[PDB]
Amino acid sequence: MLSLDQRIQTLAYEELNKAVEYHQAKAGTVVVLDARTGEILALANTPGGRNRAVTDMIEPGAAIKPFVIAKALDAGKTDLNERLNTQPYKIGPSPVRDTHVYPSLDVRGIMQKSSNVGTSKLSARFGAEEMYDFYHELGIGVRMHSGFPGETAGLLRNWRRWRPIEQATMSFGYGLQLSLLQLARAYTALTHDGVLLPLSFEKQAVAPQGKRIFKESTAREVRNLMVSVTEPGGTGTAGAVDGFDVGAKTGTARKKHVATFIGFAPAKNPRVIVAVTIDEPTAHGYYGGVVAGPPFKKIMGGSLNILGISPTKPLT
Template sequence: MRAGSSYSVRTRPVPASPALRMTSTRVRCVLLVLALLFLALIGRAVYLQVVQQDFLQNQGEARFRRTLTLEANRGVITDRNGEPLAISSPVQTIWASPTDMEPVPPAKLRELAGLLDLSPEELSAKLSDRKKEFVYIKRQISPEQADKVMALGIPGIAKQQEYRRFYPAGEIVSHIIGFTGVDGKGQEGVELAREKMLAGKDGRRVVLKDRRGHIIEDVAAIEPPRDGQKLALAVDHRIQYLAYREIKAAVEANKAKAGSVVVLDAKTGELLALANYPSFNPNNRVGVTPEMMRNRGVIDLFEPGSTMKPLSISLALEHGKANLNTVLDTRTYMIGPATIRDVAPRPSLDILGIIQKSSNVGTSKLALMNSPEESWKHYDALGFGRAPETGFPGEASGRLRDWHKWRPIEQATMSFGYGLSVSLIQMARAYTIFANDGVMLPISLYKTSNPMPGKRVLNEKTAHEMRDLLIANSQPGGGAVGGRIIGYSIGGKSGTARKLEGRSYVANKHRALFMGFAPGHAPRVIVTVMIDEPTAGKYYGGAVSAPVFSQVAGGALRILNVTPDEPSNNTLLPESTPVPVDF
């Protein structure tokens, strides 16, 4: 090559090796795959965020969104004077969401079970179903006990406020008030009858919770609960206590199966007291039997025996078939093959004598002066055979057969209390005609300032005559002497009825009865008493039930500040005084 000369050198391209060509292809493939994956992710995101948005939101809320019930406070039940008979106290309920829970360590499980008085096995069974989102662990425990549970810090365990019913008077008023179940709903008595009024309406709160059960935020407006209304009964807790004390003492003293007493306001028909024994404590129903829970004064039916006689006799006076001067032959007589007799027969008696000596013969002859239809209409007007409409759940209607099917003997026996069935509260209502000038008052379970109008059954003249006859029956020689009250006049009628078992009357099983009012001349209270199967030696109504009437009616008059209408030195007859037969 010479100096200064120029020339160009051609570079020949080096051919790509096969390995290099393979690497480039792989890169492009990888980039393509990554691009496709990225597009798939974008598509999936769009699908989830747009197409499946509602579904996913619902699923998320289903796991962490909860609707909490804000329990309404059940209405207070009081007596007529505002004394509380049923109140609600705040308690806590422990619940869990097994689906949100991890397995609980054995030590924590045992500690939780101990706080809730559960066995570890029982607690494990409640938490074992992981599909459940809600399960009660223990209901209605004290707030202090609930705080100890929550202090364990177990995820998925939560508490909720509820209310537990408490009955300050316990067994004294349990058959009237009834009780609620663990869910707070009425089960018996007034609690059941007025459930809608007392319960109110629960509120609700929709929240989001974390996995530990803690509330994160509200996701909707809170709906506050509407508390139940206050309910005032016609019952006077002082008279109720007195009635329960006396009926319990009488049942125990006479070794009886059971007993009931009803007290009505003679002017308004309000139920001042209704007590049964045996009874039960609604605050602790462990060991309570159905027999203890029977509201016998309302649902038990019986043949009223001689206490029916004034009601039957009043019809003969009302229709003018007899008057106070009428004298009847009261010797034993026959109706077909049946014999009508008195325990202590007398050749003749006037109307007062028939009541004082409790004459079956005289009463039946007076009843037979009326047609069967007339007698049926009278008994029907008195409410027999129909529910008394007091408002008590399960109140009995009794039995009054169609008059077309009556035979003469049946019309006769019904007049002295056999062949029809009644409840004690029906008899109390029927006796309002004697205390209220012939008008039968409806019974009011609730306090009222405007009593419902009654229905006239007798004219005033007949009602006054019957009232005077029943007052005279409380004087020496009458069957109501055992019901007399120091300082007050009374009117009343005792009765003793054999019990029917199967198709036969049992000679040694009786119901002792007494129906009456006081003061006699201006009645303020009506008291009816029934003692079932007294077995301590005495079984006549005048000896067993009349003293209960005396104590309850006398105490009620003093509680109500009723002015005595007889001298304070009028004395009761001693127990040794023979009681006229009312059987």
């Protein structure tokens, strides 16, 4: 039988539409996954021309940063105590900067404040070929074979053509591309304790055999870091869900802007992944947290409710 949950599908499409209209956007997409099995619970596109979750590739922006941070932790290139100099810099003429100047951040801060500088410095501790293989094993550039026509493979440029500035910008999500379904898939490596799942349109009695990408301890620490994104001081507080700890990342691509919000809950033992992108918002903000956060919040909270997941902390 199909994995789609019609209750979540309806909830996803309605909230997506509210957001796209309210922000006077061109389009929008939602993916909802079972965080433990990878089955696809919901897939919503508006307007309903094509399956943009599968056909349209986007630059993930900051939504890629957790994987770089996870890889740096996993390989022992950093730890939870290091404070990195996160002053903006240039490589040749090209700047690498954050929205604010943070003189130093630890890894939690790099996640919480979404530091392009900190993430690029962690990525630079790896060679281009290593980082290329890592992005490829996350599935970037690898077709999903979903069976929808026009399905995209995404874009992963051959590592031999990378300039050093390009490795840096890929680490915070520019210069590589993937569909929203590919991005949601990558997040199963974080929610399923380091094991990337293949995804499925059929119900899974047990989590299928995946592929380990991170140690379990790495994945668990990274999930805890991502909760700071939705707590005060983080960039994605608009995606907080009452009664739950939500690990998330928010991002803004450039096209004009594409606002993205992706997250999972309960963060400690995830049940659901919700990924929202809003194409070309023109009203009431353009950042991922402001535009895609609110629909994420509604779709996640409703999905947890529909699925009978009780809150882990008192409601406020």
